[PDB]
């Protein structure tokens, strides 16, 4: 149970230099000099990467039943070093069950991962477990908010201000009674209206800006600019990761320049559709998001000479704040979830979550259906 | 024993009426100058005789829970009610609609009534649409004898459901007509938070609809001078406002009351304990728990600014009895036999009488089912 | 303005059900004192005296089975009976009634029954109601016969459930046990009696269900209250066996216009010393129909609340002592519902009737200490 | 976080003699020779007492609204050394909410205790969170079964075999999908029918006897005899503790004699009514169960010269089995929940749960509303 990781260059979001880290399920003790032992010389110790937006049950289906994407194998997470995922439903609210989403999140947790879910889906009014999104967040311990509610998209339900305000108010007080944060995840399409509705709430109500969490905020110039204003008023935005004009990389730099990286987060959009529509509202082709798009994006920003100290924020501190999680920092009391990158190779070699090795030195623990 | 006489008391029929003997059963039979079947007597030499205090806003089941499940405050004991002189309470639900039962609040009102107290309740809670007993707020007031209105409906608070005007117009309409059918008052209690919109909605109702003002009963309105100034505007149009009673723990409710009395508006002011109700500092932190002690304490503190007792007692006896159309708050023939007895010198509650029975006799409390 | 709150009745021969001779009674809304002659012109404050020389003081009559909203309608929409007038009750010395629904549970609402009980309450009468009707499953205020008895003060049980009747829903034994279980535990929570009133037709099965429940379950017999048990003598003899196991049976009072009657039944229950186990009910504003042998409607009479005092007067004409006959309409109905009525004594609710000593007519009526009728004159009423 | 309890006479259900016990939130290491340290010489170390049947929200009300009992203060648990409680609803299913019961159990946990709940109440059909007792046990992580279903009582709903069989089958499969045990708690009244229905199930169906958990099985001679047969067929019974003819003490001995103590458990019936009814079904007087009735019962059996080794079974091993709990034994990996009794004084002095001291050496931690 009690474990050590000696003579690793410990990279708590800000650099804390060559130190040993003792840990059960949480960081128990830190101290330079000397149950399981693990030597990690040559490796960098980070806190486990956080993914706040992943279609863990699969998604897509904009082009029919054929375009229904596959469910997520934990196999892919561990190679990518993603130790905690927040599962949401997407465009399809009928064939993808909320109970199914509870279960996949419950199974991912039982095979070593850390899981939380939303209770909504694209459409307003939102699908529920118990008839009421407030009731869901008080009674289902894993529910941390609602989404992903579509706004300014062609696949939107066309929601009104008053409808939405109901939801936010219900989910917020839902939070307070239950002692959770109570987030609203906001799928933002390519409509000109953008995130107007989000400004309305904070301007015209008693609603704090912490509860509003818009995603895909990197997909255009225009929209990222709105994402920065929203940031500058004390709110946090989320950017969809880059994965094989203007990219998610340029944006994550453009936030450092204007001094706003403390308000950014990245999403894999794993197992989610990446659809291409023509001149009308017809469907042309698709791609499928990969949960290894996080670590891939991190390295392509370091490639531009940003400090690894202030890039790990987007995936470790910045997300853990948004959801009020006891994770995302290597320090006494915090939950014990780390990844280990080799020197200047820049490749994950080991992965720890809740103090159990899921990947040790490039050999994966074996899982039930692989 | 069940026909009683209080002798040699200086009586405050709210208004002062000098030294008088009161004869009562469950209601007052006679008030006259010294005179004399088995009947009990109580010599009240040295004592003042006042009406029973009325508390229009108490979370008798418990409330709060806004800081998580750890914030769940405990339920009201009647013990407090007897030592603090409160013979009548009106129970309501708060921010938690899901885990605090309406049906639980009906049962809590029934146990307290049954150990010598007087109880009424509101249906619903903070959230719009409001939780009901029977699917309909108009049905509830008609069918369940203790429901006297709806609340506390949250306007201009961060924990508000963000209600529209249209929603609130149906709600007050429904409970008003429901009030008429049942022969009760049909009050909407409004929880007013610290939002800039204040009570704009209440003004919107009287300015653009047929709905009388007597149904709109805003509470918490000594939280800022700005709100109170908008409260007084309301008072001048026939409305009644509730002030949260100062507790044993700028601009205060004591300030607030004297400002009202000096404008000749103390007839339009009441005070609530908000007992067992959460009192949290919410910043952009901490919590404390209201006591029913808060009203008699607040009465003294305003007496200490030199206001005449008979005129002050109106905020807790005459003015609540009016708003809920109750047969209480006045010592007279036909009125309900609810009295407190305070030492004239000490000014500390020594005996409390509810429905003509002694709940406390010279400091010695009646003993109850779980003490 | 209000009427003098302390009253005294002097020089009456008091039938506190049990005879207690010439006594004065001081009262407000409850009975304050029973005692020998005492100086009643010594009080310094208001007090209305009433001289009752030559009259008999008795408790207020309780009528446990009344269609206060109207009922009937077995012969089409033309056979719906009118609703009860409080002047009927005042003339008949009936100070308390318990109202129920019957055959029609489609066009007679429970909310309408709740209102009429409250309007009766407010003119000087004491009122209670049942939830449900004839049919199984039973109609409800709130969706459940348990919520109704817990949330609605005036609700004291469910009925009248139709068993051994052509108009019955043909209820199952499992259906009925669920219903009696629900209303009892409901009574326990709300501190009421939790009664199931049974409307018993003329089926061969009689009350087999009532005997099935007591013999095969822990449900005590206090909660099973069957009515119309003088219908046929076969049914009345099934009633007596029910009595000897601690039960209470209700008989429909003899009607002032028309062989084995409820008089025969009452006298047989005295003979066998089981008079503590019977009640009588007017079935006022109820259908009293005739069906031919094919099951079709022929015609009907309408029950009357005058039936109670009328029935008691017949029984007296057969030499039974007054002090023991009054049980059926005072002590016995007060038991079944756990009411603070039916006896003249310190503490008890001040519901009286006064009868002339030879005439044996009701001349004055007092409920809540208030005179509804004083010396044959009624008080002014709301819609009369 | 890491704690030791040195030179205590460690009384793992069976005696393991003077040993040190290291423990975070679970028993981490056991070893004789030598972060917080606690010396416990003179004291006996036991595993934390288990209460499988407590009306944590209050109950009673058979005699009106006046007879409604008060809610349970954690203050009383800690003095009594009761570290884990299973909350149920009783006779009243209307005024006592299931949401209220979730919350009180949630609050007791947040102030140091360990809590689980049922989803039913006396009446059949049973009240639910989500419309369906199966759905409740899959979706509400704290739900471990259904009860307390009344059988052979005057306050019974009069349930049929077929109705009940539905429930048991639904709760069982509910268990399997969710990876919980899925118990049916059975309030048994003083009816002659007794637990007949329980024999029917195992005789006439494919239903395993582990799911059937009858309570109050000590209240009569006749019924305890039925409790022993049920035991002898591989099932477990529950006895209502003794607290100030034939008692719960005689019975717990009578199980040792016939060699059946491995199939017994004790309940406080805390905050529950103990009602007295006369000749008919009317109510006379009441008493209110106390959660300190457990430890009080334990000592009055030791008074009869039974080994403390084989008496702690009823409150530690026997209950933890029934509910499939990682508790009730002092040994590596088990959750860290202990009580400390002084020499031959026989009085709790300290109480530990999840490795946090709730009572240290007779001074209680201070709690929010005391
Ligand atoms: C990458 C961009 C262009 C596509 C993206 N749409 C979705 O991701 C669809 C949704 N996740 C699903 O599962 O169906 C967008 O926000 O614009
Ligand atoms: C004047 C202040 C103290 C009013 C207000 N209090 C609450 O909202 C308490 C809530 N109604 C409950 O009891 O559940 C506040 O502090 O914001
Ligand atoms: C005694 C006989 C003739 C009348 C009785 N019918 C009813 O009581 C009708 C029902 N209660 C109603 O009015 O809706 C019966 O047939 O047994
Ligand atoms: C001790 C025995 C005699 C009484 C016991 N009844 C209950 O405990 C009632 C239930 N817990 C409640 O909360 O209402 C029994 O099983 O026989
Ligand atoms: Zn999206
Ligand atoms: Zn998406
Ligand atoms: Zn408030
Ligand atoms: Zn309040
Ligand atoms: Zn009938
Ligand atoms: Zn009838
Ligand atoms: Zn029980
Ligand atoms: Zn119990």
Author numbering:
A (entry chain D), D (entry chain D): 1 to 34, 43 to 252, 261 to 386
B (entry chain C): 0 to 35, 41 to 253, 261 to 295, 300 to 386
C (entry chain A): -3 to 254, 261 to 386
The authors write:
In the present study, we functionally characterized the hyperthermophilic M38 β-aspartyl peptidase FiBAP, a protein repair enzyme involved in hydrolysis of isoAsp residue-containing peptides in F. islandicum AW-1. The overall structure of each monomer can be divided into two distinct domains; an N-terminal β-sandwich domain (M1–G56; G344–E386) and a C-terminal catalytic domain (L57–K343), that are mainly involved in dimerization and catalysis, respectively. The catalytic domain at the C-terminus of the molecule folds into a (β/α)8 triosephosphate isomerase (TIM)-barrel motif.
Crystal structures of the ligand-free form of FiBAP and the ligand-bound form bound with N-carbobenzoxy-β-Asp-Leu (Cbz-β-DL) as a substrate analog were determined at resolutions of 2.6 and 2.7 Å, respectively. Cbz-β-DL-free and -bound structures belonged to I422 and P2212 space groups, with one and four subunits in the asymmetric unit, respectively. Intriguingly, the ligand-bound model included obvious electron density corresponding to loop P290–L302 between β14 and β15, which might have been stabilized upon ligand binding. Remarkably, the Cbz-β-DL-bound FiBAP structure aligned with the ligand-free model with an RMSD of 0.433 Å, despite the good superimposition of the structural elements. Such an unusually high RMSD value might be ascribed to the transformation of the missing loop (P290–L302) in the ligand-free structure into two stable antiparallel β-sheets (β14 and β15) in the ligand-bound structure. Since this stabilized loop is located next to the substrate-binding site, it might function as a gate for substrate entry and/or product release. There is no significant perturbation in the coordination of the binuclear zinc center in the Cbz-β-DL-bound FiBAP structure. Residues such as Y130, G68, and S289 are placed closer to the ligand than those in the ligand-free structure, thereby assisting coordination and stabilization, while R227 and R163 move away to provide space for ligand binding. The other surrounding residues that help to stabilize the bound Cbz-β-DL are the amino groups of main-chain residues S289 and G68, while T99 interacts with O04 and O05 atoms of the side-chain of the Asp residue of β-aspartyl leucine to stabilize the N-terminus of the dipeptide during substrate recognition.
